[PDB]
Write a protein that binds this ligand. Structure first.
Ligand SMILES: [Mg+2]
Ligand SMILES: [Mg+2]
Ligand SMILES: [Mg+2]
Ligand SMILES: [Mg+2]
Ligand SMILES: [Mg+2]
Ligand SMILES: [Mg+2]
Ligand SMILES: [Mg+2]
Ligand SMILES: [Mg+2]
Ligand SMILES: [Mg+2]
Ligand SMILES: [Mg+2]
Ligand SMILES: [Mg+2]
Ligand SMILES: [Mg+2]
Ligand SMILES: [Mg+2]
Ligand SMILES: [Mg+2]
Ligand SMILES: [Mg+2]
Ligand SMILES: [Mg+2]
Ligand SMILES: [Mg+2]
Ligand SMILES: [Mg+2]
Ligand SMILES: [Mg+2]
Ligand SMILES: [Mg+2]
Ligand SMILES: [Mg+2]
Ligand SMILES: [Mg+2]
Ligand SMILES: [Mg+2]
Ligand SMILES: [Mg+2]
Ligand SMILES: [Mg+2]
Ligand SMILES: [Mg+2]
Ligand SMILES: [Mg+2]
Ligand SMILES: [Mg+2]
Ligand SMILES: [Mg+2]
Ligand SMILES: [Mg+2]
Ligand SMILES: [Mg+2]
Ligand SMILES: [Mg+2]
Ligand SMILES: [Mg+2]
Ligand SMILES: [Mg+2]
Ligand SMILES: [Mg+2]
Ligand SMILES: [Mg+2]
Ligand SMILES: [Mg+2]
Ligand SMILES: [Mg+2]
Ligand SMILES: [Mg+2]
Ligand SMILES: [Mg+2]
Ligand SMILES: [Mg+2]
Ligand SMILES: [Mg+2]
Ligand SMILES: [Mg+2]
Ligand SMILES: [Mg+2]
Ligand SMILES: [Mg+2]
Ligand SMILES: [Mg+2]
Ligand SMILES: [Mg+2]
Ligand SMILES: [Mg+2]
Ligand SMILES: [Mg+2]
Ligand SMILES: [Mg+2]
Ligand SMILES: [Mg+2]
Ligand SMILES: [Mg+2]
Ligand SMILES: [Mg+2]
Ligand SMILES: [Mg+2]
Ligand SMILES: [Mg+2]
Ligand SMILES: [Mg+2]
Ligand SMILES: [Mg+2]
Ligand SMILES: [Mg+2]
Ligand SMILES: [Mg+2]
Ligand SMILES: [Mg+2]
Ligand SMILES: [Mg+2]
Ligand SMILES: [Mg+2]
Ligand SMILES: [Mg+2]
Ligand SMILES: [Mg+2]
Ligand SMILES: [Mg+2]
Ligand SMILES: [Mg+2]
Ligand SMILES: [Mg+2]
Ligand SMILES: [Mg+2]
Ligand SMILES: [Mg+2]
Ligand SMILES: [Mg+2]
Ligand SMILES: [Mg+2]
Ligand SMILES: [Mg+2]
Ligand SMILES: [Mg+2]
Ligand SMILES: [Mg+2]
Ligand SMILES: [Mg+2]
Ligand SMILES: [Mg+2]
Ligand SMILES: [Mg+2]
Ligand SMILES: [Mg+2]
Ligand SMILES: [Mg+2]
Ligand SMILES: [Mg+2]
Ligand SMILES: [Mg+2]
Ligand SMILES: [Mg+2]
Ligand SMILES: [Mg+2]
Ligand SMILES: [Mg+2]
Ligand SMILES: [Mg+2]
Ligand SMILES: [Mg+2]
Ligand SMILES: [Mg+2]
Ligand SMILES: [Mg+2]
Ligand SMILES: [Mg+2]
Ligand SMILES: [Mg+2]
Ligand SMILES: [Mg+2]
Ligand SMILES: [Mg+2]
Ligand SMILES: [Mg+2]
Ligand SMILES: [Mg+2]
Ligand SMILES: [Mg+2]
Ligand SMILES: [Mg+2]
Ligand SMILES: [Mg+2]
Ligand SMILES: [Mg+2]
Ligand SMILES: [Mg+2]
Ligand SMILES: [Mg+2]
Ligand SMILES: [Mg+2]
Ligand SMILES: [Mg+2]
Ligand SMILES: [Mg+2]
Ligand SMILES: [Mg+2]
Ligand SMILES: [Mg+2]
Ligand SMILES: [Mg+2]
Ligand SMILES: [Mg+2]
Ligand SMILES: [Mg+2]
Ligand SMILES: [Mg+2]
Ligand SMILES: [Mg+2]
Ligand SMILES: [Mg+2]
Ligand SMILES: [Mg+2]
Ligand SMILES: [Mg+2]
Ligand SMILES: [Mg+2]
Ligand SMILES: [Mg+2]
Ligand SMILES: [Mg+2]
Ligand SMILES: [Mg+2]
Ligand SMILES: [Mg+2]
Ligand SMILES: [Mg+2]
Ligand SMILES: [Mg+2]
Ligand SMILES: [Mg+2]
Ligand SMILES: [Mg+2]
Ligand SMILES: [Mg+2]
Ligand SMILES: [Mg+2]
Ligand SMILES: [Mg+2]
Ligand SMILES: [Mg+2]
Ligand SMILES: [Mg+2]
Ligand SMILES: [Mg+2]
Ligand SMILES: [Mg+2]
Ligand SMILES: [Mg+2]
Ligand SMILES: [Mg+2]
Ligand SMILES: [Mg+2]
Ligand SMILES: [Mg+2]
Ligand SMILES: [Mg+2]
Ligand SMILES: [Mg+2]
Ligand SMILES: [Mg+2]
Ligand SMILES: [Mg+2]
Ligand SMILES: [Mg+2]
Ligand SMILES: [Mg+2]
Ligand SMILES: [Mg+2]
Ligand SMILES: [Mg+2]
Ligand SMILES: [Mg+2]
Ligand SMILES: [Mg+2]
Ligand SMILES: [Mg+2]
Ligand SMILES: [Mg+2]
Ligand SMILES: [Mg+2]
Ligand SMILES: [Mg+2]
Ligand SMILES: [Mg+2]
Ligand SMILES: [Mg+2]
Ligand SMILES: [Mg+2]
Ligand SMILES: [Mg+2]
Ligand SMILES: [Mg+2]
Ligand SMILES: [Mg+2]
Ligand SMILES: [Mg+2]
Ligand SMILES: [Mg+2]
Ligand SMILES: [Mg+2]
Ligand SMILES: [Mg+2]
Ligand SMILES: [Mg+2]
Ligand SMILES: [Mg+2]
Ligand SMILES: [Mg+2]
Ligand SMILES: [Mg+2]
Ligand SMILES: [Mg+2]
Ligand SMILES: [Mg+2]
Ligand SMILES: [Mg+2]
Ligand SMILES: [Mg+2]
Ligand SMILES: [Mg+2]
Ligand SMILES: [Mg+2]
Ligand SMILES: [Mg+2]
Ligand SMILES: [Mg+2]
Ligand SMILES: [Mg+2]
Ligand SMILES: [Mg+2]
Ligand SMILES: [Mg+2]
Ligand SMILES: [Mg+2]
Ligand SMILES: [Mg+2]
Ligand SMILES: [Mg+2]
Ligand SMILES: [Mg+2]
Ligand SMILES: [Mg+2]
Ligand SMILES: [Mg+2]
Ligand SMILES: [Mg+2]
Ligand SMILES: [Mg+2]
Ligand SMILES: [Mg+2]
Ligand SMILES: [Mg+2]
Ligand SMILES: [Mg+2]
Ligand SMILES: [Mg+2]
Ligand SMILES: [Mg+2]
Ligand SMILES: [Mg+2]
Ligand SMILES: [Mg+2]
Ligand SMILES: [Mg+2]
Ligand SMILES: [Mg+2]
Ligand SMILES: [Mg+2]
Ligand SMILES: [Mg+2]
Ligand SMILES: [Mg+2]
Lengths: 47, 272
RNA sequence: CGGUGAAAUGCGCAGAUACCGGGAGGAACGCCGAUGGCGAAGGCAGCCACCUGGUCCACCCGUGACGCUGAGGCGCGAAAGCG
RNA sequence: AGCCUACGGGCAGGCGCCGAGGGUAGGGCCCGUGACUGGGGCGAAGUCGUAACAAGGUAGCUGUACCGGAAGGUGCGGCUGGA
RNA sequence: CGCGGGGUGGAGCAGCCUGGUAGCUCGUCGGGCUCAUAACCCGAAGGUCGUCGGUUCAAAUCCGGCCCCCGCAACCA
RNA sequence: AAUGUUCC
RNA sequence: GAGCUAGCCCUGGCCAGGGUGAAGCUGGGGUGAGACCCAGUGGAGGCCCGAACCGGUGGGGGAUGCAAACCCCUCGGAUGA
RNA sequence: GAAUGCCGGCAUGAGUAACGAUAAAGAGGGUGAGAAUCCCUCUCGCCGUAAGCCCAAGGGUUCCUACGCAAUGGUCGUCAGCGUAGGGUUAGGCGGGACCUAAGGUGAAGCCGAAAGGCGUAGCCGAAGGGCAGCCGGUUAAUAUUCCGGCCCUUCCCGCAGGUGCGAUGGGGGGACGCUCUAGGCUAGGGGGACCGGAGCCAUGGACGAGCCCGGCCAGAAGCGCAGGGUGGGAGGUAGGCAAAUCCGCCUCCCAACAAGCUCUGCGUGGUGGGGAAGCCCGUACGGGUGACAACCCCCCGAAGCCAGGGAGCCAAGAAAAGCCUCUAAGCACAACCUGCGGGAACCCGUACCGCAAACCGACACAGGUGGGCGGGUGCAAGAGCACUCAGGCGCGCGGGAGAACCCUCGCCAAGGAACUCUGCAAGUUGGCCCCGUAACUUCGGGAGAAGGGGUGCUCCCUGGGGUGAUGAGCCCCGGGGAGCCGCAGUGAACAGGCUCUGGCGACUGUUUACCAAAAACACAGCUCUCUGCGAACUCGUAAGAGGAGGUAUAGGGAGCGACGCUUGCCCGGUGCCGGAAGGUCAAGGGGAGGGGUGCAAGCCCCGAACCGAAGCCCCGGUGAACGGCGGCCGUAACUAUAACGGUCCUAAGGUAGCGAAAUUCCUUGUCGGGUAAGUUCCGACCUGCACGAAAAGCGUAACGACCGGAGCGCUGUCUCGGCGAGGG
RNA sequence: CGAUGUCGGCUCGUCGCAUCCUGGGGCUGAAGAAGGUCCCAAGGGUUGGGCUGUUCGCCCAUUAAAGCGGCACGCGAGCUG
């Protein structure tokens, strides 16, 4: 049947995107941990 | 003259539709200082507040002249009687002689092509508007303001009316549709005559979906719920409430008054 | 205080009954009024106005037997009752 | 495809429509019966009350509606078969 | 066989808790009113307190043991 | 302020 | 974290084909005027049968499966909540 | 040495199950070291409202070509969606952005919050919505509405030539809107044709013939023509459109009443341009040449699409903004705007490929899921159904044998026909269309497809309507009548209800436990109670604010009951709710009689009784469609039996109507009656209701039900009681 | 209790005898027939339906008889539910 993942470039960049992170003080801490750890991809890749 | 239906399918033996003969030949609405976009919404910024609103047919908000002191002494010709989905009452298109086109909430007995004017001069004929202090005692009236210069806010549902019972100083005493006796300031405007479409009480919605057409979602009783959701709920089958009857929030719903006691409007109220 | 044959229930020391002044609302219209009138029956009673029916008298003016009753039908139909 | 005495005929034979009745199914009317149940009539001396007839001890009767073991009581309106 | 409550004149109930004396209503009997009955009025009689024991000077009353009556309970797989 | 067995 | 799911807002789309024939019109009839009655027209409906679509009633299979909810037969709704 | 310990490796099961839909394969010839799997040909089978074609999302090189098989491929593999390398995606007109707004997000001013932050008119962002200028062919191995060819357009900028008071983010018009059913005329698509064009064929008994087979088209400015859609024209007066207006609106006179006239679409035709089968010949994976000076004509059906903003009916009353037209103000009128014609300028991104699937979501080449458009023909009444089939695409990435039990999926059966069993669970019967015919009941609609039947093919003859057509032929829809033929059998295959009687429950259509429960549960119109006079009541939030609602007692919130019919009796003693300027109690505070500690003293500092002190509670009342409750014992009648009646105790009051061994009943398979040969179930009664009962509603109720219970008929492998056959294992 | 699936039915049985029938025998208040009771005996057999989920039980129509029990109230890596 219909599974959980029904992808959308529109939704993924607005929910998890970089500009979505910086609006919240929560999301600013999200990147701040990911810079600290050393992620190559701070945000998920949208093309 | 309420239309009945032959019982050709079930829920049409009871289904009941109001008479539309008083609607003159004006089915499309006017524009240009007439409808705004009406935002349908069951809820505030976020969560639901008034539960079980939703659905419903799409509507356009006919903007209504509740404040008819704008055009004192200026007469009007009743152009048309139109349908309003936003209201129980009907609405009357008015062409002013001045040139404006506004709607007034259509009173009872008003016919097409009748002169109508607002102000202090304003002779006592159905549709005209006056201060309350200039209206004779005992006349039925509607669209009454509460405080002056704030808009018509009283007695404007279908077939409603307020009756003047007397004067006292700068205030007049009204018999409201609730039966409450209320002191209202004399300068508050008010439009004489009852509202009409009085047969709106006699409609029978017939089936379930006509409530969904109006925008009324299904309503779930408390005793059909579980006790997390409602006080009445739970219980192995059909418990008889076991407690004084309450809301989902705990406040009782059989006889509990909740008017704010220390309200400054208390000393203008005489009756229930 | 009410109330009865006499009482009691009840109402009242939180201000009752009896009084005056003001306000709301509903129903029925005293005297006139009668052994009266009107209507086919049921029935109809403060007053005003509108609409409207039956009826009686005078003049003997016109039609010219157009009349009487009425199975069914149709309409009215106190009070109580139903939506 | 038979038989015949006159053979562009008849008979035997075949086919078809109608057809008594039988079968299937569903209706109408009537009769008998049916656990139980409603009220009725009759039945020498059963039980409970007093409804009515004298203002029958609340005048009576009545249409309707409600109630009550029971007659009945009460309400609304009517009648004189009462003052 | 668990828990609680009850057995009182002929019928129905008190009085038990705080021991010393058993009362109310109907009924029964006698007499009044009536012509006679019922209603009503005046008198009166009637009770091993379920039994068996024992605590006390003393028991319907306090405590045990049986016999009946009423109510509750008798659940989990 | 209720009532009066059956037939004669 | 509402890209599954529940609800709602804004905007678009979809519903083969058959039936049943409500109101309303028009004509005739009827009456003092009506109510009303016949036809003919008309095409209403959380109407009917039934594909796409939406479901998941009963059974069978499947059970280290094609599948962490499937397949076959059957069945409900299908202009409406 | 053990902790169902951790990590790693290797065993056992075991050469076992499985190899992923039962749509199907066989042969010849190539290439190769190696072919059941790669290529070609021939034959067969499967899809064909797709298993074919075009988009959108998603995926990101998977597309094409060359070299190759270690690994992936459930086998093999020369093959590939795989490895290496090279190539390939071309836009003023397609889609998106230098245009607009909706929900929503953001947010100058402003409001709020310990901080973080939360609201918030205007503005801004925000799209399959609005607006906007391109159609047909041909080329590549891979792109094309993008390149090329033909034809046609749109913006700007600069010039000229002709016109006019021009001129705004401002006013107004317009854009601009539902559902259902429809009219007329077109088009897309399709069918036929003795007519036109065409290579070829006469087979096997017959036919050189109105013979067979294939094909008869697309686009196209101006101009015409055919259908439509839009809008009255003047003259005054004007206080409204937040300044003005010649525009809009309002009022009064005239002329039209129509589309007569302006426009604007659609469709034909149109200068012309392109395409152009079947067969044969070829050499490719795959395309080419000829057929071709190709023909390119006439009928008929005909849309859900177009003219579009068409019409009619109905209630639930059906977006905004910009583009566009007009009107004017600041400014200007050497400016500017409009029209025509020249020349010039016309940017950024996507463009391959799969796209109901082996390239998306499911760890997989997964029998699942995934939005839009085209989706041919014939026949079956119609149709997107069903069967066969064009175009097109596949035979599902393990096979060869054999023909045991057993299993799955099917097919048939004597005689009996539910005896099986919890239960006809399952399977069978019936099934489409047309025409007869159809009950109790009923809310007058229904029940109804009730039930129960009859016909259904082909040939010939006669005959009635329509439509396109000229009133005619033809072509196409509906019919009627009469003769006749064949088969066991005519919706001859496929798709296609078993029915009835009677209970319970729920009124009905609907909804739910994704993933064991679709129901008698939830919802539902409707009934009642209660709250709420607006800055409402209630909800969310600390607040601001917002929902309610741009609503106003015929409205909104909460609660129960759940159409409808007939009804909803008694108790306010306790709890709750409502009303009550008395009283009792009561906190902080007021007040300080008195008393205490210190000081030599004035003083400073503590406790502190009277009394005055709100809500709440006690107290007085009302309130049951508020929470709730609604008795026990004994006697009595002239056969017994029973009790209309009486006594007594208690309560706040002691279950009324209606129903009752029921979805309530323990004893209980209560006792009668019916159905049956036999009935713990069912149906109808009795009432001894352990323990119904009136809005946690009571008693009924036509219709409805994938609910639950009982019975009958029809029919059958459910069974007696098995047997045989087929395909996949 | 780091799991022993529990009623009833279906299929398959097998065993014990304190035997339902058939075989043999004693007594009988056994005339005969048909019975009663008791002993020996299990080799074989022990039906089909209605009701209930039923084991049991009650009936219908039969029969020579329509037996009682054990095997985890036999049997769910065999089925039903
Ligand atoms: Mg505008
Ligand atoms: Mg917001
Ligand atoms: Mg938010
Ligand atoms: Mg509800
Ligand atoms: Mg529940
Ligand atoms: Mg919750
Ligand atoms: Mg709670
Ligand atoms: Mg219960
Ligand atoms: Mg409760
Ligand atoms: Mg004369
Ligand atoms: Mg009357
Ligand atoms: Mg009356
Ligand atoms: Mg002859
Ligand atoms: Mg009879
Ligand atoms: Mg008397
Ligand atoms: Mg009397
Ligand atoms: Mg009397
Ligand atoms: Mg009385
Ligand atoms: Mg009287
Ligand atoms: Mg007198
Ligand atoms: Mg006692
Ligand atoms: Mg006692
Ligand atoms: Mg005596
Ligand atoms: Mg006496
Ligand atoms: Mg437990
Ligand atoms: Mg427990
Ligand atoms: Mg239990
Ligand atoms: Mg007597
Ligand atoms: Mg006597
Ligand atoms: Mg969602
Ligand atoms: Mg239809
Ligand atoms: Mg009609
Ligand atoms: Mg229809
Ligand atoms: Mg329907
Ligand atoms: Mg259907
Ligand atoms: Mg489709
Ligand atoms: Mg669902
Ligand atoms: Mg299923
Ligand atoms: Mg069906
Ligand atoms: Mg180890
Ligand atoms: Mg060790
Ligand atoms: Mg091994
Ligand atoms: Mg082997
Ligand atoms: Mg093995
Ligand atoms: Mg094996
Ligand atoms: Mg195998
Ligand atoms: Mg495979
Ligand atoms: Mg070779
Ligand atoms: Mg095929
Ligand atoms: Mg897209
Ligand atoms: Mg993409
Ligand atoms: Mg992938
Ligand atoms: Mg690659
Ligand atoms: Mg190669
Ligand atoms: Mg390989
Ligand atoms: Mg290599
Ligand atoms: Mg694989
Ligand atoms: Mg391999
Ligand atoms: Mg090779
Ligand atoms: Mg490739
Ligand atoms: Mg490659
Ligand atoms: Mg630019
Ligand atoms: Mg730019
Ligand atoms: Mg845009
Ligand atoms: Mg933009
Ligand atoms: Mg914008
Ligand atoms: Mg906005
Ligand atoms: Mg700040
Ligand atoms: Mg914000
Ligand atoms: Mg767009
Ligand atoms: Mg668009
Ligand atoms: Mg474009
Ligand atoms: Mg391509
Ligand atoms: Mg092209
Ligand atoms: Mg070009
Ligand atoms: Mg402009
Ligand atoms: Mg504008
Ligand atoms: Mg064409
Ligand atoms: Mg054509
Ligand atoms: Mg053709
Ligand atoms: Mg030819
Ligand atoms: Mg030949
Ligand atoms: Mg004009
Ligand atoms: Mg102005
Ligand atoms: Mg015209
Ligand atoms: Mg053309
Ligand atoms: Mg043209
Ligand atoms: Mg060619
Ligand atoms: Mg229109
Ligand atoms: Mg607008
Ligand atoms: Mg704007
Ligand atoms: Mg325009
Ligand atoms: Mg101008
Ligand atoms: Mg491309
Ligand atoms: Mg492409
Ligand atoms: Mg598709
Ligand atoms: Mg995949
Ligand atoms: Mg998976
Ligand atoms: Mg993959
Ligand atoms: Mg595969
Ligand atoms: Mg797949
Ligand atoms: Mg889906
Ligand atoms: Mg789909
Ligand atoms: Mg088609
Ligand atoms: Mg087709
Ligand atoms: Mg045929
Ligand atoms: Mg056809
Ligand atoms: Mg068909
Ligand atoms: Mg189609
Ligand atoms: Mg098909
Ligand atoms: Mg083919
Ligand atoms: Mg395979
Ligand atoms: Mg055969
Ligand atoms: Mg058979
Ligand atoms: Mg047979
Ligand atoms: Mg049979
Ligand atoms: Mg049976
Ligand atoms: Mg059996
Ligand atoms: Mg049974
Ligand atoms: Mg059954
Ligand atoms: Mg079945
Ligand atoms: Mg058949
Ligand atoms: Mg029925
Ligand atoms: Mg009918
Ligand atoms: Mg039939
Ligand atoms: Mg029926
Ligand atoms: Mg034939
Ligand atoms: Mg035509
Ligand atoms: Mg014609
Ligand atoms: Mg035949
Ligand atoms: Mg069939
Ligand atoms: Mg049934
Ligand atoms: Mg039923
Ligand atoms: Mg039952
Ligand atoms: Mg239901
Ligand atoms: Mg009911
Ligand atoms: Mg239905
Ligand atoms: Mg579930
Ligand atoms: Mg679950
Ligand atoms: Mg289910
Ligand atoms: Mg269901
Ligand atoms: Mg109701
Ligand atoms: Mg909030
Ligand atoms: Mg708060
Ligand atoms: Mg607000
Ligand atoms: Mg609002
Ligand atoms: Mg309400
Ligand atoms: Mg409400
Ligand atoms: Mg309910
Ligand atoms: Mg009825
Ligand atoms: Mg009640
Ligand atoms: Mg009470
Ligand atoms: Mg109370
Ligand atoms: Mg009280
Ligand atoms: Mg104090
Ligand atoms: Mg102090
Ligand atoms: Mg107080
Ligand atoms: Mg008594
Ligand atoms: Mg009572
Ligand atoms: Mg009973
Ligand atoms: Mg029987
Ligand atoms: Mg029986
Ligand atoms: Mg019964
Ligand atoms: Mg009970
Ligand atoms: Mg109940
Ligand atoms: Mg109740
Ligand atoms: Mg109910
Ligand atoms: Mg019932
Ligand atoms: Mg029923
Ligand atoms: Mg159902
Ligand atoms: Mg349903
Ligand atoms: Mg049976
Ligand atoms: Mg079998
Ligand atoms: Mg086989
Ligand atoms: Mg254990
Ligand atoms: Mg173990
Ligand atoms: Mg032995
Ligand atoms: Mg023997
Ligand atoms: Mg023997
Ligand atoms: Mg013998
Ligand atoms: Mg013997
Ligand atoms: Mg049976
Ligand atoms: Mg055994
Ligand atoms: Mg045992
Ligand atoms: Mg047992
Ligand atoms: Mg066992
Ligand atoms: Mg099992
Ligand atoms: Mg078992
Ligand atoms: Mg076992
Ligand atoms: Mg085992
Ligand atoms: Mg079960
Ligand atoms: Mg089951």
């Amino acid at each position: 049947m219909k599974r959980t993942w029904q992808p959308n470039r529109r939704k993924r960049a607005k929910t998890h995107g970089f500009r979505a992170r910086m609006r919240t003080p929560g999301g600013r801490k999200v990147l701040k941990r990911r810079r600290q750890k050393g992620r190559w991809r701070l945000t998920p890749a949208v093309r | 003259a309420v239309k009945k239906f032959k019982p050709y399918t079930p829920s049409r033996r009871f289904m009941t539709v109001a008479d539309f003969s008083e609607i003159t030949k004006t089915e499309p609405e006017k524009s240009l200082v007439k409808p705004l976009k009406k935002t349908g919404g069951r809820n505030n910024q976020g969560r639901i507040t008034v539960r079980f609103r939703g659905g419903g047919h799409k509507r356009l908000y006919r903007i209504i002249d509740f404040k008819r002191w704008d055009k004192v002494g200026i007469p009007a010709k009743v152009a048309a009687i139109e349908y309003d989905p936003n209201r129980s009452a009907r609405i009357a298109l008015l062409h002013y002689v001045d040139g404006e086109k506004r709607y007034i909430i259509a009173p009872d007995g008003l016919q097409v092509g009748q002169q109508v004017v607002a102000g202090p001069d304003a002779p006592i004929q159905v549709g005209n508007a006056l201060p309350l202090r200039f209206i004779p005692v005992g006349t039925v009236v509607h669209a009454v303001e509460l405080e002056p210069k704030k808009g018509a806010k009283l007695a404007r549902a279908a077939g409603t009316s307020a009756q003047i019972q007397g004067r006292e100083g700068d205030y007049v005493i009204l018999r409201l549709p609730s039966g409450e006796l209320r002191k209202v300031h004399g300068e508050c405007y008010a439009t004489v005559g009852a509202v009409g479409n009085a047969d709106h009480k006699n409609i029978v919605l017939g089936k379930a979906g006509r409530s969904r057409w109006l925008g009324r979602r299904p309503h779930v009783r408390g005793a059909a719920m579980n006790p997390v959701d409602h006080p009445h709920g739970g219980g192995e089958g059909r418990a008889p409430r076991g407690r004084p009857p309450a809301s989902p929030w705990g406040w009782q719903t059989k006889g509990l008054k909740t008017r704010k006691r220390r309200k400054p409007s208390s000393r203008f109220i005489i009756a229930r």
